[PDB]
């Protein structure tokens, strides 16, 4: 039953959310992580 | 040197993170070898 | 914008690939109709 969410109208600050090293792997496709913190998103949707 | 095998990831060309953003960090164009091993049997205090 | 230049170098390298052989095929196409053009030029000389 894996969870779906949306996410929508938020300042991400996705350096703050690379601090938590409890993270045990990381990996992004599309983009590089380091430019996480330098792009804009229209459209974003979690799973967990 | 010795440091934490949880990092050990991060020290590899090409590879990046924390310890490679701001601990140390090998060039992307590197020429040589990375060896390590586990010294908990000495190291540990 | 997107990308790590270890990533980035084999898109990179494609486009590359792509847009010269393109200026390849547009240069050799048009020195065939440069030829053409020449043969004509040296029948109208003749004519004049």
Redesign the interface.
Known sequence: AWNRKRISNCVADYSVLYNSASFSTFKCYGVSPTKLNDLCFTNVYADS | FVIRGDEVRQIAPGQTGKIADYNYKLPDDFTGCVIAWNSNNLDSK | ???????AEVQIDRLITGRLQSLQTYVTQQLIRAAEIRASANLAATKM
């Open positions: 914008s997107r990308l790590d230049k270890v990533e």
